[PDB]
Amino acid sequence: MATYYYALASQKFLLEEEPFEEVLKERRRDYGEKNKEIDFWQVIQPAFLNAPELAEAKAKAPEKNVAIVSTNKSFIVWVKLALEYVLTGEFEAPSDAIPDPLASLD
DSSP states (O other): OEEEEEEEEEHIIIIIISOOHHHHHHHHHHHHHTTOOOOEEEEESBGGGGSGGGHHHHHHSOSSEEEEEESOHHHHHHHHHHHOSOEEEEEEESSSSOSOTTOBOO
16 A cells, blocks of 8 residues: 545636646656656546545545545645645555445446
C-alpha cells in the first residue's frame, strides 16, 4: 500500500474556471524528458471519496467533484498553493475500501 495525496475541487472550478489539463500535460512532458514514471493523475468524481475513512471530506465536498492525486506530496502542496479553493488530504491504497485509487464513479 502507498500513500496517495489529493487536492479535491468542484468540477465547475477545476474543469471550467481553472482547467488544469495543460498543467498536467506539461508535467508529463517533463517526466518523459527524464524517463520518470508518472506519479500524478486527474480523477473525475473519484471513487476514493466513498471510503469510510474519508467520510468527513465527502461531507464537505461539492456534489460534482474532481481530484488531482499524486504519490508526491510536494506536488499536491504546489496544487493547493496554486489553486486555493480545494480540499486536501491523503489515504492509502489499495485496500478493501479503496481498491483502485484512480477509479472514477462517473
